[PDB]
Structures are given as structure tokens and as C-alpha cells.
Design an enzyme around this catalytic site. Sequence first.
Site, PDB file in Angstrom:
ATOM      1  N   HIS A 109      -5.333  33.527  40.576  1.00  0.00           N
ATOM      2  CA  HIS A 109      -3.913  33.225  40.485  1.00  0.00           C
ATOM      3  C   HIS A 109      -3.391  32.711  41.821  1.00  0.00           C
ATOM      4  O   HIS A 109      -3.897  33.064  42.890  1.00  0.00           O
ATOM      5  CB  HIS A 109      -3.131  34.467  40.055  1.00  0.00           C
ATOM      6  CG  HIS A 109      -3.607  35.056  38.764  1.00  0.00           C
ATOM      7  ND1 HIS A 109      -3.375  34.460  37.542  1.00  0.00           N
ATOM      8  CD2 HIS A 109      -4.309  36.184  38.505  1.00  0.00           C
ATOM      9  CE1 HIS A 109      -3.912  35.199  36.587  1.00  0.00           C
ATOM     10  NE2 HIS A 109      -4.485  36.250  37.144  1.00  0.00           N
TER      11      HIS A 109
ATOM     12  N   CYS B  20      -7.047  30.584  46.360  1.00  0.00           N
ATOM     13  CA  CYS B  20      -5.765  31.278  46.331  1.00  0.00           C
ATOM     14  C   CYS B  20      -4.791  30.659  47.326  1.00  0.00           C
ATOM     15  O   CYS B  20      -4.769  31.029  48.501  1.00  0.00           O
ATOM     16  CB  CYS B  20      -5.957  32.765  46.639  1.00  0.00           C
ATOM     17  SG  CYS B  20      -7.128  33.603  45.549  1.00  0.00           S
TER      18      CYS B  20
END
Lengths: 225, 225
Positions: free
Chosen positions: B92, B134
Site C-alpha cells: 500500500h 512504498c
Amino acid sequence: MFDPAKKYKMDHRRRGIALIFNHERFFWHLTLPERRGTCADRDNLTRRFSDLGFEVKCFNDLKAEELLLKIHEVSTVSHADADCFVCVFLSHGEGNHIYAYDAKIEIQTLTGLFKGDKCHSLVGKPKIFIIQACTLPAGADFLMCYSVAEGYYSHRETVNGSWYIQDLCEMLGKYGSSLEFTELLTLVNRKVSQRRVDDPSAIGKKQVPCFASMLTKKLHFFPKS
Amino acid sequence: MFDPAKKYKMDHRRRGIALIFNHERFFWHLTLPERRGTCADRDNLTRRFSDLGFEVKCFNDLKAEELLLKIHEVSTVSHADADCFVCVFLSHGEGNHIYAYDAKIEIQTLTGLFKGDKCHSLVGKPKIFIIQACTLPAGADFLMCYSVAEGYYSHRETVNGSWYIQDLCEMLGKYGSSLEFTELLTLVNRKVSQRRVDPSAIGKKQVPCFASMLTKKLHFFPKSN
């Protein structure tokens, strides 16, 4: 719509500058193979990039005065009528911590000067950096070519130069004006990784080069005009 | 003699395993677009790699006991009759420092399991790691593909997935079975770098990258049924 075969525009007047940077300062005891090998690499590079239409310029970092003089030149000079930019960073293998640490600072400086923000004339044009390690530069349309992944084996210098520059120059002279440049670098990866020691301590180990691409199109160096 | 068009041998019985690794643990709050976007990415990747002949496996790091189990499986299983190995690392975008630091160790561990010394059955066969950041992984016949440079802008997840995975999957579907893989990754570099934002991301663009230690041309032509 989307063209898988789109290529960088290589029909400008000039090809561009091919900067060969020799990292020398802070390197003291220079053996006979190292001194004759470094000169062989530079001359071999000057011939292969010149034959591809580049305007070769060779600096070194011994004279701090002349260094800033010529660095300022290539950074501020206009590349509007150029196809691309090439910079080759040459260094010696058996160096101390001061020599190695200076190289990292020099490489960061050089690569930083040609990013989009500081060089409008190279925006959308390939910026090729060939680094003979003793890293993490990045940018749109950059191509980073490393002689070895940091921390892994690289063959000592020889009277005829280094394995990486010898094989890179053989492919450049043989396939430079025809093959796509990243296909060419892949051939250098194979040629270098296939070489073996005749240094009995370095038996069984190989030198694995690497290249990191942020290019967006195919890159060719067909003969100009 | 030397063949500039030599390619990896891809005529084994099986294509190989395509491991899709979902990094989830230590993410402190997961919004709705992030839950679905990650699922859209996983399903899109499963469809494209399956159509190229891969045996797709999907893990996550929520259950610590079940992960080391399955990491052991894919690492130790034999690949002698496999063409190659693919591993996609999904994560994410808006993560905390713990989430990001854990990702680095996971990537460092995953890539390490498939070094030549640790996996004799993949020696001389391409090992492909596609990392949604990330970094410094290396090894002969490794191909590292990054969604973004180390510290630059990456567009955020949506209901249909991330820009990088969407464009990667679009190229795999159309050109996966024909184009050389690094050529395909270059098309991804262009597609992702051309996308604009519809808030606080004015003038930003996501620039992907890939690092190649491959020695030959890599194709995924249709397998023999």
C-alpha cells in the site's frame, strides 16, 4: 494510439556530448597495469563513442581549478540540437575509503546536473551514465549502466583495460550503430559474466554487470545524416 | 560464434511459479479504495500471468505462522522443469515507517532465497521480481522491476488498482506473448510516466524503473499446450 516501436528522436544536428570522466585524486600508489589500463579504457571509449557521432570530452579531477572550469561548461552548454548525452565515469579498483567515498559524491553531482529541472535542453532526451564502480541515481529518460553490483566481484585492471570497458567497447564497435542500446548492454552482461580468471584466489567467481533503465522509448544510434 | 539474438531457453515442461506477495501486516487503517484496489491488482496479475503459462500463487503476511510455511514451499520446491520464476510484491502507498521498513526486509529476504547458491534449479534461468514500492537486490539473471524510483512520486491506489499494475497488465495482455520482456517494461515506463493527475499532485508524474542482470533476450511465447 500507442506505438510499441516508438523511438527517441535521433535526427538532431549533433549526436551530443560523450563525457569521459577519470577519477584520479586521492589515489596514490598507481601500478603499471592500472596506469596503462586506465589509458586503454579511455582511448577505447573515445574511439567507439566518436564513431557513433559523439563529441568526446575527457576530464579528470586532479586539478580542482580546471575541474570546475570544464564541469560548468558541460552543465550550462545548450543541448537543444543534440540527440542525447553520455557520461562515462572511470575509476580504479583497489582504492582506499577516501577515494571510494569521493567517487560516490562525484557521481551524485554529475547525475544531478542533467536532471530535468537543471537542464531543460535534455528534457525528453536519453541521459546515459556508464559507471565503473570501485548506486541510486534516478530520473526520467535516464539510463544507468554499472560495471558491477556494489559489493560483488569485479576483475582487477589489466594493461589492456578492464573487462567491462573492453566488452562494452567491443559491442559498441560491432553493434552500436544497429542494435537497440539496451539489447547491446544485455550482450555486455553476458560477455562479462562469461569471463573467468586464468589470481588463484578469485577462482570460480564472476563479474555480473547491471543496467537500470528509466527510458520510455527504443534507443538507436543509426549513422546520422 | 557470438549470437546477439540469443534468448533464454523457455521450452521446459512448465513455465514456472508466479508468486504474488501481498504486504498487509502493520498497515494501521485501510480505506475502501485501498482494499479493492489491492484486490483489483491481484486479480489482474493472476489473469495475465496465468495466460502466459505461470502457476500463480498468492500469499499475504497476516498469518506469521502460515507465511514461513509457504515461503519454505516455493523456495525449496524444484524448478528443474520450469522456464523461470516470477515474484510480484504488492504494498500500500500510504504506510507508516514500520510498514515501509518491514517491506524492505521482506523484499531482501524473498530475493535472497533465489540466489544461485540457494536455488540450484533456477541457475541460469531468469528470476523476475516486480516490486510495488512504498533497493539493492542483485544476482545473475535477475530482473528487478520497480513501480517507482526510491523516493519519488507514485500515484495512489484506486478502486481499479494502481497505475503501475494496470499498465503492466495491459501490456502483458496485448504484448506479453510476443515482445521481449525488457522492451515490454519500457512501454510500461512510458505509459505510467504519461498519466496525469485529475488535488495536491499537480505537475507530478510517476516514473517506473527496472534493473537488469539478464544475459539473453527474454520472451514468453505460447507454450506447447
